[PDB]
């Protein structure tokens, strides 16, 4: 529900897509 | 709560009041009633020297008790034991204080509180911190309800009060200054100077505290107790 | 044994959490013109005389 934790959840996934992508470039 | 202690000794009877002796506190000469109270201490044993443990006690007593009359009812006075001999141990001035309920009565809203302190020393090498408190008052025939001060009267009032306290201490060593607070004469002087700035009711000055002392001067103390 | 006979002039009303205490403005029989309020347990009418072991306990008033 809470938009505070969907912002937090997305930010933690921003880290993952940014860290898994560094393995290529 | 009674049967709750689990362990009383980390490792694993004689009544003490029969071993104690009673004295009587003597107030300085600048007080109406020399009789103050009564204390306790063990006998002067071969190692403890119970006269020594009784040397530095500090007792606080109301000024109404010392002066008899109940006008000076709040006015807490602290007396410090300086010399003991012949079971009439002698005490000297140690500081004056206000009762909490008196201080809280004066502080009411819709009026300005003014405070002022100085660190002026006396002629007998005593060092004190005089505190002064005052409250703005609503002049007669006033309509508005608060009557605050304009934050420049306060600076002028605080400058006037600080100047008065320093001058009124230099020259008064211990005795006349103690006999200056008892008859409430300093505050009457404060009102006279500040009556041209702002009304300022309730100029009961404040508590006073000692900071440091010179050499004992045993003869000076004996000059008070006759 | 100080015993005071006091005669009531007014029944203020019931009081207490469970409504078992009555408030009464009661005058003293002797030394008239000095009165007191006293909690009363049982039923009382106007101009009834009471017995006291304390004369000047002022019961609290709900006002």
């Amino acid at each position: 529900m809470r938009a505070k934790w969907r912002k937090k959840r997305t930010r933690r996934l921003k880290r993952k897509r940014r860290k898994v992508r560094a393995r290529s470039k | 709560a009674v049967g709750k202690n689990k362990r009383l000794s980390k490792g694993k009877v004689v009544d003490p009041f029969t071993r104690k002796e009673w004295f009587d506190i003597k107030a300085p000469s600048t007080f109406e009633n020399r009789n103050v109270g009564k204390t306790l201490v063990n006998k002067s044993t071969g190692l403890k020297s119970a006269s020594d443990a009784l040397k530095g006690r500090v007792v606080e007593v109301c000024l109404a008790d010392l002066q008899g009359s109940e006008d000076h009812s709040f006015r807490k006075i602290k007396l410090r034991v300086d010399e003991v001999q012949g079971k009439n141990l002698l005490t000297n001035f140690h500081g004056m204080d206000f009762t909490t309920d008196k201080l809280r009565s004066m502080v009411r809203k819709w009026q300005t509180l003014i405070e002022a302190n100085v660190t002026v020393k006396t002629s007998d090498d005593y060092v004190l911190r005089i505190f002064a408190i005052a409250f703005t008052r609503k002049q007669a025939n006033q309509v508005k309800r608060h009557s605050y001060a304009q934050s420049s009267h306060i600076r002028a009032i605080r400058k006037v009060i600080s100047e008065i306290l320093t001058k009124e201490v230099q020259g008064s060593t211990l005795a006349q200054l103690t006999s200056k607070l008892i008859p409430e004469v300093i505050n009457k002087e404060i009102e006279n100077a500040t009556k041209d700035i702002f009304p300022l009711q309730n100029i009961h000055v404040r508590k006073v505290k000692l900071l440091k002392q010179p050499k004992f001067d045993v003869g000076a103390l004996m000059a008070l107790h006759g | 044994t100080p015993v005071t006979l006091a005669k009531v002039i007014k029944v203020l009303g019931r009081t207490g959490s469970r409504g078992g205490v009555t408030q009464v403005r009661v005058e003293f029989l002797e030394d008239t013109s000095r009165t007191i309020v006293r909690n009363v347990k049982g039923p009382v009418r106007e101009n009834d005389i009471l017995v006291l072991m304390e004369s000047e306990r002022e019961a609290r008033r709900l006002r």
Partner: protein, 127 residues
């Protein structure tokens, strides 16, 4: 004509302290708390427990030589509630009956000039 002590009644919540000392305050007489007279671990601050504790202080005063007392009522103070506990009044109430003479009742609750911080967090104590 009177031997005067200082009551120094400290009645916080969860307990109540009453212990009379000498005028100088360095020699104490018969310190008994509210948790010494009842075994509940919950009625330590109760008015009944303080009533029993006050009588013991007053009783032991007679055999020592204290016939009058100066009352100094105290709350926890500091950053805590600063209000007297439930047993503060009963302790003062009870010792008057034993025969001690009262004088110069005064509140000695320590009050700060906006001191450090109060425990509980920003959102208080959630209940």
């Amino acid at each position: 004509s009177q031997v005067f002590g200082v009551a120094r009644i400290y009645a916080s919540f969860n307990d109540t302290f009453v212990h009379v000392t000498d005028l100088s305050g360095k020699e104490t007489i018969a310190r008994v708390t509210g948790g010494m007279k009842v075994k509940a671990d919950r009625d330590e601050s109760s008015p009944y427990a303080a009533m029993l504790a006050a009588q013991d202080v007053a009783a032991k005063c007679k055999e020592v030589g204290i016939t009058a007392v100066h009352v100094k009522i105290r709350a926890t103070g500091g950053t805590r509630t600063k209000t007297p506990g439930p047993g503060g009044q009963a302790a003062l109430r009870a010792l008057a009956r034993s025969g001690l003479r009262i004088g110069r009742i005064e509140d000695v609750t320590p009050v700060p000039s906006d001191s450090t911080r109060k425990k509980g967090g920003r959102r208080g104590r959630r209940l």
